[PDB]
């Protein structure tokens, strides 16, 4: 019954819009199946969650800095004077069925959005996918990272509570106010006056629900358009070449895989939003300029900034009648970091003179210098992040606050150098391990004592033998365990408690072995013919 | 291929032709269960079915728990608080379990039943073929040359001038509503009108104004006068500038004034009574040698680094600590920053007592209070 | 700037950093550790930690520079 309906709908669609050639082109598109190429998709899916829950939260939030008395259901804040935004956030958490769940799913989705953007950036940087022709796509990704950081900052600043208000007062007010020539002008353009104003929360709400989400949506659209029409990169392999893409077509493998990954990511976010508490605002109270708390940290994607401000050593300048405070350094710091993130492909293009079209990715071990730089930057970022959390670390792990401060100060110099050295040597050593495997064959772990007393290990050559002929490295991973090449065999087929009849075992094992040979043969023929 | 021979192609041949048109060759594609009628196929089918059914039952559990669980907030230490505490975790459990099980079932169906394939597509990337590049370049150059705008410099110059002028005017008329002068005198003072950053609630307004150091009771009458004997040695107090003409919170204008003094970012003051056995250790700042009243000193409760409340008073070290970035000022040395990213001392408020004995401010801060800026000093 | 014997996969990606960058980096890191002794702190244990780490860095740079200047290290 549905076949005739499908045929008639397809005929109507083709008669009206004639999309057949374009739809077939989009269905036949080939995407490589590496797991790391899924990392970016996480940042996509969480963002969609951030839209959905976000819209829900817009139906109950009043972003007014007007001050009222609570008279809600939450007793430990009855009669407390608070802003209207804080009261509406409390009403979401307590007066709307499922409001707390939506708030927590939203905050968890924001955290996963930031974290997955960071992990995807690590993948892109270490595999060298920022190279020509994909430099602009790296620029777009860096802009998206910055926008997501500031979007999350504004988001958790929206409910005017003690912690978020303290973060606003510290960063967005103090750093802005201290900028050399235009700092107070920027502060009074943003806040409409002094920090404890009346327009900040509505302005941040407008920026955070409409403006930044719109910019991020447009940038993600352009990003994915570039990825789609500049076909995905790939790692060097059996059938791979700079002029092809080896993987699976969109219909139906890629579509089903992407949908199932979306569903599983939504499941993880829902489980975390239900079972784990995030941002319990009612415990913090309304924001008051006279109160602060010991544990003053932003969401983790901003933590590094505070760490920088915690570690930079009180260096201020006093030109003719003017003051340049310490916070200026922090601002410049961030600027430099963002700058150094946006223009990295061009920096490496200038340094190495490599301006060739590249579609085959690089394993990080094959680029020891870039791997060393990336490990150095990750070490510095982690150190600043933990220096932001050095009060909690001091409290839980018994260590003095000054000790953590000086460890951070000395570390932001010593640790990146050690990490650079270790990463460089480790990458070259991984290269050497690859060469050893290619030249002697895989070590099988089997030791024989020859009649004259020789203890030898059985090597399994990956190519022909003359001792094997040493193969040539081709930028691809190599096997180093025999169970990964099939030596481990197959278990008896069954239900983990009862076997199937041996005829079915024979049929299935023989069919699977034949299919594996057929797949390897097809790849071998394609490789031989194209080369 | 013609219509007649297209009419006589099998579906596999048509798929091959369609892929070949797009540049895709599927070099391997084999069914997942070549051997018919095995128990393993039944087992895998039932596994996928069980995962999808768990997703369905968890979605049903989500519906039921959402509709029927007792969700309303319950006060502290009462019956029904355990069910309330379980309300949101149950929503998360049911929702996440349902959609995660559906996703797992889909993954298992892909891995176990959808045939494994290896397709190869040609990138066709890099430079375009010369025909396309030359035709598009010729179209663009022909537009620019037939326009004749190049050989008409007056029109081009006028167009540039006009577009730039309109853009500048629009940008100025756009941003200009946000631009506020921070130094427009708007705050009254016993010395005229002064900018906001130069003034706080401690700034006297009619040249002899009695400004009381009032504690926050945190309640109708949230501020009250206080006496020097209301602070034991080694004790810390947060005081605010409260005047007689501010009220007691009964009338609505009184509450507005009390709110506006409680929300003043530069209002809070830390008042500390040094133990006399340590008053020999006090080093006083030049120009503030007479700002304390005996054992009671008063400093700003605003960090000089970035404006957070430096509100951690360690009495046995006399150290003021700011939790935002771990700055440490020495309360025995005019709040000089001894540690952290702070490089400027906290302002000291001059205090004394009135005729009745109630602690009052003996003038204004002798410097700007909060974090520094360009125009300071 | 490297050979296949030193970095096997040298043709495949960026694999050499000029030793000047490392030498001036060490000198600048030592200078930063030293200049961090000017500031606001009563105690002087941190000054000795900074001096020790700067000494270690300068010693490493000096040894590496000397050995490349004499020929042993390349």
């Amino acid at each position: 019954d549905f076949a005739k309906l499908a045929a008639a709908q397809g005929d109507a669609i083709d008669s009206r819009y004639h999309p057949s050639a374009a739809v077939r082109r989009q269905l036949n598109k080939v995407f490589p199946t590496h797991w790391s190429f899924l990392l970016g998709e996480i940042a996509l899916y969480s963002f969609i969650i951030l839209l959905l829950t976000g819209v829900w939260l817009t139906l109950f939030f009043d972003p007014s800095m007007a001050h009222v008395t609570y008279d809600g259901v939450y007793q430990p804040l009855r009669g407390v004077q608070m802003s209207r935004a804080y009261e509406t956030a409390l009403d979401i958490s307590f007066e709307v069925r499922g409001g707390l769940f939506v708030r927590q799913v939203h905050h968890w989705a924001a955290l996963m959005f930031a974290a997955s953007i960071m992990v995807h950036l690590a993948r892109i940087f270490f595999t060298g996918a920022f190279r020509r022709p994909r430099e602009a796509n790296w620029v777009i990704g860096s802009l998206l990272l910055i926008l997501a950081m500031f979007e999350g900052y504004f988001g958790y600043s929206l409910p005017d509570d003690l912690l978020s208000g303290t973060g606003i007062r510290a960063a967005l007010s103090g750093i802005t106010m201290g900028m050399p020539v235009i700092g107070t002008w920027l502060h009074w353009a943003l806040f409409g006056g002094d920090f404890p104003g009346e327009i900040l929360i509505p302005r941040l709400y407008a920026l955070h629900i409409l403006l930044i989400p719109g910019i991020i949506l447009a940038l993600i659209g352009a990003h994915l358009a570039l990825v789609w029409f500049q076909k995905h990169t790939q790692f060097p392999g059996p059938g791979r070449t700079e002029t092809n893409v080896v993987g699976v077509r969109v219909m139906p493998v890629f579509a089903v895989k992407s949908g199932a990954f979306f569903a599983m990511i939504t499941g993880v976010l829902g489980l975390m939003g239900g079972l784990l508490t995030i941002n319990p605002i009612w415990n913090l109270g309304p924001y008051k300029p006279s109160q602060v708390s010991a544990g003053s940290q932003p969401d983790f994607y901003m933590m590094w900034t505070e760490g920088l401000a915690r570690l930079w050593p009180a260096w201020e300048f006093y030109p003719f009648g003017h003051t340049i405070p310490q916070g200026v350094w922090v601002a410049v710091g961030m600027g430099l970091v963002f700058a150094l993130l946006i223009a990295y492909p061009f920096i490496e293009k200038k340094v190495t003179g490599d301006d060739a079209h590249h579609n085959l990715l690089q394993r990080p071990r094959d680029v020891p210098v870039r791997t060393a730089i990336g490990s150095m930057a990750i070490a510095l970022y982690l150190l600043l992040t933990f220096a932001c959390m050095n009060d909690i670390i001091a409290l839980k792990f018994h260590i003095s606050l000054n000790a953590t401060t000086w460890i951070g100060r000395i570390g932001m110099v010593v640790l990146p150098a050690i990490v650079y050295f270790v990463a460089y040597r480790w990458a070259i050593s991984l290269q050497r391990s690859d060469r050893e495997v290619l030249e002697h064959g895989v070590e099988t772990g089997i030791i024989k004592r020859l009649p004259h007393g020789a203890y030898v290990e059985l090597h399994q050559p990956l190519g022909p033998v003359d001792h094997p002929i040493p193969l040539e490295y081709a930028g691809a991973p190599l096997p180093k365990r025999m169970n990964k090449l099939g030596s481990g065999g197959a278990p008896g087929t069954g239900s983990f408690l009862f076997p199937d009849p041996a005829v079915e075992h024979e049929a299935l094992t023989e069919a699977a072995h034949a299919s594996e040979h057929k797949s390897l043969t097809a790849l071998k023929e394609h490789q031989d013919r194209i080369h | 291929p013609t219509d007649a021979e297209l009419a006589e192609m099998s579906r596999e041949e048509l798929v091959k032709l369609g892929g070949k048109i797009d540049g895709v060759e599927t070099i391997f594609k084999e069914p997942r269960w070549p051997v018919p009628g095995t128990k393993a196929e039944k087992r895998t089918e039932r596994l996928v079915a069980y995962w999808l059914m768990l997703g369905g039952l968890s979605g049903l559990a989500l519906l039921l728990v959402f509709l029927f669980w007792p969700w309303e907030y319950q006060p502290f230490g009462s019956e029904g608080e355990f069910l309330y505490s379980l309300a949101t975790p149950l929503y998360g459990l049911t929702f996440g379990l349902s959609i995660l099980s559906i996703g797992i079932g889909a993954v298992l169906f892909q891995k176990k039943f959808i045939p494994e394939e290896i397709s190869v597509q040609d990138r066709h990337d890099g430079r375009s073929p010369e025909v396309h590049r030359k035709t598009v370049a010729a179209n663009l150059t022909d537009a620019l040359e037939g326009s004749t705008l190049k050989r008409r410099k007056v029109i081009g110059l006028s167009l540039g001038i006009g577009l730039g002028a309109f853009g500048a005017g629009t940008l100025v008329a756009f941003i200009g509503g946000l631009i506020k002068n921070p130094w427009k005198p708007v705050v009254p003072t016993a010395e005229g009108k002064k900018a906001v950053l130069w003034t706080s609630g401690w700034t006297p307004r009619f040249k002899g104004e009695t400004i009381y150091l009032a504690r926050a009771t945190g309640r109708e009458s949230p501020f009250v006068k206080m006496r020097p004997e209301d602070i034991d040695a080694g004790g810390m107090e947060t005081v605010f500038p409260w005047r007689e003409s501010d009220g007691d919170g009964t009338t609505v204008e009184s509450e507005h004034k009390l709110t506006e003094i409680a929300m003043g970012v530069r209002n809070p003051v830390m008042l500390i009574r040094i133990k006399p056995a340590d008053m020999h250790r006090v080093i006083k700042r030049k120009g503030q040698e007479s700002f304390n009243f005996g054992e009671l000193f008063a400093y700003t409760k605003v960090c000089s680094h970035l404006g957070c409340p430096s509100s951690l008073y360690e009495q046995q070290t006399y150290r003021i600590l700011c939790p935002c970035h771990q700055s440490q000022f020495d309360a025995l040395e005019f709040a000089k920053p001894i540690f952290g990213p702070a490089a400027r001392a906290l302002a000291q408020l001059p205090i004394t007592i009135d005729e009745d004995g109630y602690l009052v401010a003996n003038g204004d801060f002798v410097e700007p209070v909060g974090p520094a800026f360009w125009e300071r000093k | 700037g490297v050979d296949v014997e030193d970095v096997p996969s040298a043709e495949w990606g960026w694999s050499h950093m000029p030793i000047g960058v490392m030498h001036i980096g060490g000198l600048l890191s030592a200078a930063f550790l030293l200049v961090m002794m000017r500031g606001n702190h009563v105690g002087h244990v941190e000054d000795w930690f900074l001096i020790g780490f700067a000494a270690v860095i300068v010693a490493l740079v000096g040894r590496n520079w000397w050995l490349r200047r004499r020929g042993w290290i390349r």
């Binding site: 006093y318 | 002899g208 009695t210 006083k284 030049k286 040698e289 000089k336 001392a345 009135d354 000093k377 | -």
Partner: peptide, 28 residues
């Protein structure tokens, strides 16, 4: 990454200073 400068107007003193006088407030 440069040096530090002390605030020009943050020196210490040696004068002990006089005890503050009792406060009287003008009527308006």
């Amino acid at each position: 990454a440069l040096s530090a400068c002390s605030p020009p107007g943050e020196t210490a003193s040696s004068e002990p200073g006089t005890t503050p006088a009792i406060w009287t407030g003008s009527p308006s």
